[PDB]
């Protein structure tokens, strides 16, 4: 009831983050289509968490540049959330925010100039929501998927948010739509929980849903890419949309989101808190960061791996659903994968011994 925070490192600990790691010698990029950061909140925070801050860098991207507009409430927010979300869980990682002009061509044109960075040379790509997948033009789904095979292909991990407003995803059709890109059968869609934790142990850990009003993690059945071949013993459900029909499901993991306990960050220098999946796509980027530090070679596209892996690997989420719209509970979070937080929030530590040869 009474609302709460927690620092990146208190999510990171009861997630069972592997110690001893930073990302050294990793960098994890960061895809922005509006807003700006400044040093100086930056500085603070990193100062206030006792990390050795991380460099970060700004890349333009068709002309666009880091332009804070200094109100903690507009995108300055998403963007130093997903700054100091990464930065603060792998400081030893080398952070490259590219910004771009806010059009699919640009969004595009930003994620293909981080994949193939020569000067950066990102492991890891970090975005946040795109809209639901159906509203977006069809060749620039096709552009965009392609982008992220080809990032799979070249062994970069991409991180996506599933979406802030539940099931329907903002559409007022009378339909379901799950978010572009975490449909993307190449991208780790990040869904979001509401987490109730402390230094030792996660008291309670639901589905991120403050209804209408406060929010719900996306989550779904996609109705353009079809169910992927290793999510076929997932246990996807059929789409609730009329017809129905398999499709891939979305999320594959989730993490804390919910902004009743959300993110302690410091936003145009002010201290304040922040929620969404947003930040869960840069938290687990950190957590992949660190993996490949361990493992001496990147992960890269981790999906087929992960629906694999025991479900020890796993902290299963099993209550709670992400309708916004209506009272048919559609999505509802159930034992193994769903359509709200996937396989649930990794666990850490066991997640890299699973993946050390
Ligand atoms: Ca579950």
Redesign the pocket.
């Known amino acids: 009831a009474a609302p709460t925070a927690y620092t990146p490192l208190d999510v990171a600990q009861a997630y069972q983050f592997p110690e001893g790691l930073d990302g050294q010698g990793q960098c994890i990029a960061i895809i922005e289509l509006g807003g700006g950061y400044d040093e100086t909140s930056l500085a603070q925070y990193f100062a206030s968490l006792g990390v050795s801050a991380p460099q970060v860098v700004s890349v333009s991207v068709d002309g666009a540049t880091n332009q804070p507009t200094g109100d903690p409430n507009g995108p300055d927010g998403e963007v130093e959330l997903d700054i100091e979300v990464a930065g603060a869980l792998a400081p030893g990682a080398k952070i490259a925010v590219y910004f771009a002009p806010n059009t699919d061509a640009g969004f595009l044109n930003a994620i293909t100039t981080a994949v193939h960075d020569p000067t950066h040379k990102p492991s890891i790509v970090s975005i946040s929501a795109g809209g639901p997948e159906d509203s977006w033009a069809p060749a620039s789904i096709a552009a965009m998927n392609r982008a992220f095979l080809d990032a799979a292909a070249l062994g970069v991990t991409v991180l996506a948010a599933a979406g802030d407003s539940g099931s329907t995803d903002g559409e007022q059709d009378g339909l379901y739509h799950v978010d572009f890109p975490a449909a993307s059968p190449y991208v780790l869609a990040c869904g979001g929980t509401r987490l109730v934790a402390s230094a030792g142990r996660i008291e309670r850990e639901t589905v991120w849903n403050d209804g209408p009003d406060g929010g719900s993690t996306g989550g779904g059945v996609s109705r353009i890419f079809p169910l992927p071949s290793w999510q076929e013993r997932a246990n996807v459900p059929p789409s609730a949309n009329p017809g129905a029909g398999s499709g891939r499901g979305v999320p594959d993991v989730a993490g804390n989101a919910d902004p009743a306990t959300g993110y302690e960050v410091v936003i145009d220098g002010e201290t304040t808190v922040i929620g969404g999946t947003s930040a869960v796509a840069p938290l687990f980027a950190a957590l992949v960061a660190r993996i490949n530090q361990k493992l001496g070679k990147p992960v890269g596209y981790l999906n087929p791996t992960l629906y694999q892996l025991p479900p020890e690997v796993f902290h299963?989420?099993?209550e709670g659903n992400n309708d916004i719209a209506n009272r048919a509970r559609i999505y509802q979070?159930?034992?193994?994968?769903?359509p709200c937080?996937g396989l649930?929030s990794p666990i850490g530590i066991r997640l890299l011994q699973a993946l050390l040869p």
């Open positions: 299963d989420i099993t979070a159930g034992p193994g994968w769903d937080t649930g």
